[PDB]
Symmetry: D3
Subunit: 117 residues, 6 copies
Amino acid sequence: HCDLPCGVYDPAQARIEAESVKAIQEKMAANDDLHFQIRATVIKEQRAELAKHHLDVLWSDYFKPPHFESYPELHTLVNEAVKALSAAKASTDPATGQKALDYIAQIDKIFWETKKA
Amino acid sequence: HCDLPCGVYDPAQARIEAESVKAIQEKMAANDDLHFQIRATVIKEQRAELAKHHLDVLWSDYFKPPHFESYPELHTLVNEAVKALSAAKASTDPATGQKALDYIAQIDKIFWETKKA
Amino acid sequence: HCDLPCGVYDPAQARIEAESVKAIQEKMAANDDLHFQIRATVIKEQRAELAKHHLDVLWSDYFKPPHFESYPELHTLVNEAVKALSAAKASTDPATGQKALDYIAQIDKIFWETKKA
Amino acid sequence: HCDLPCGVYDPAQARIEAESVKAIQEKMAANDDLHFQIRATVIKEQRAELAKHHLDVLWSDYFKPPHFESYPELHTLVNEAVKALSAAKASTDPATGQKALDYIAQIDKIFWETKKA
Amino acid sequence: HCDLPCGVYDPAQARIEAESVKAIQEKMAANDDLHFQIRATVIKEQRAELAKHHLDVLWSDYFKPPHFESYPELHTLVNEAVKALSAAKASTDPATGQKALDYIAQIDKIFWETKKA
Amino acid sequence: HCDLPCGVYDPAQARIEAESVKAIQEKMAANDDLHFQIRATVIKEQRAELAKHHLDVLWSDYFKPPHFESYPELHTLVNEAVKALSAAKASTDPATGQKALDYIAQIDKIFWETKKA
Ligand code: 3NI
Ligand code: 3NI
Ligand code: 3NI
Ligand code: 3NI
Ligand code: 3NI
Ligand code: 3NI
């Protein structure tokens, strides 16, 4: 995942960050304090960006050309996932964070299928 | 390109970094001093990574579903471009840097066409 | 622009980031939503910083003593441009982003003139 | 793990980076090409640093005074783990990478025990 | 402090960042303008994080087993110092910034004592 | 030094990093091991870059127009200092690191004079 290549990848990296994004949105609904809302927004932006980065790495470095042929929906799937993360950045609604997590789950399923193959 | 969204994008960001990658490769072919080789390798790695990031952003943020339907080869084209940048990191051969640049020029063309549409 | 040196520089990197800064200010004029305003501020801060960095690099790395002799106003000009960017971080008024872009255009002109010599 | 706090932590973040560190060391033993050795060194340095960062965060943010009381060896354990990572940065011997992984697994065990209580 | 190791460390790095944190909190009380409050919060967050990083480096890289033996309360002290910085991130009260600075000064004193022996 | 502005600045941030640069160069003069030479070069590059950044910040944010009028050679001085750091990046000779330190010490002096005015 470092581009050496090192041969070590795990969608878990993107997932843990996307999980913080949703967790942050949930906490934002429980505290309307201005300063807390600013910090939560700041931090959610950073964790969603990392989640996007991790997905980007899987897309560009892990997945090889044959994988996109074997899973015709893979390009679209990863693109929708990073876009859902962009949508979560601009929202305090936990559903947006959950949507990104749902796409990550599908990508994770494909990732492991390709690992065992 | 900042995900606000700000509406400002330009493949030139990716291109300028890819140009540095090739330029460093050319300089490496001309000076075999150990320390220069280390520094050149370290720096080429960073610039190639920034070029990958910029292309990733065009792919994840600028390009929308309509664009992928109009250019069915776009997903693969950007994926190949970033993969070419990974190969450039692993190489001192300027041709690898040029390969990345050729792909970037193709993405640049499509980018501007979508901007005029 | 990577300090190898690689021999590749372009005021365009500073310009593109400064354009995002102003573009963000324009979007802040239009929408008073708290979360949007927090996110716009956060991201504007990040892009203005990158723009200052790019200018600092032109100043520290690209421009040499003969350039400062030929253009005795260059130091002041670049210093005014980065200070204008600091002013843009602290403002939502596009006039501040515009002022930074104006100084950058002046720096860009001098840059290309030095590429002619 | 983002200091909001968000309530999401997983030692897996530290483990995955440490796994890359060891995997890179193994590749370095098998390929003596100069450029590969430089790239592997640069990248191992980066992943080891990320691993130390993740451990530092668990120590500073996740673990609380009651945890250090229940596990009097914990401060020492995390300190040894990060020092083991510093040692791996300075080494191409996979055994150093393995030692950091051994400590991370002991930290992971304690982490999950605090989740049961 | 760079993990080479280089043999150069100075608690002053943590202190200067902690001083910005407090200085920012002092300024937050004198201007309730929204944008200023957002920038102040955003920037305080960043400076506090850097201060935590500098303390983490002292703890992980500079201080060694003999030092922890001679100062049995050092682990707790550094851990309390970084937690104080986390508290300062979540507060506009300069008292929180002060508390972190006070812990840092204690660490600074111990640091110079270990340097004299 | 964070651009809020926070009112906290200290040339010591730049000095400490330049000190590491020189300390690393001294170590490189003594130890010829390839892997150590790679790590030292990699890390020296990073610390020299941070030193340049700290100097750039004093120049762009701390020093104001009246300071440049009061000390006309300040622009040149900071420019030479950052160029000396670029030179240190490209050399293993401690003398280059010392030269950067000498320029920083001249800047430190003017800095404190402006503080007392
Ligand atoms: Ni990897
Ligand atoms: Ni943008
Ligand atoms: Ni360059
Ligand atoms: Ni967190
Ligand atoms: Ni160091
Ligand atoms: Ni500041």
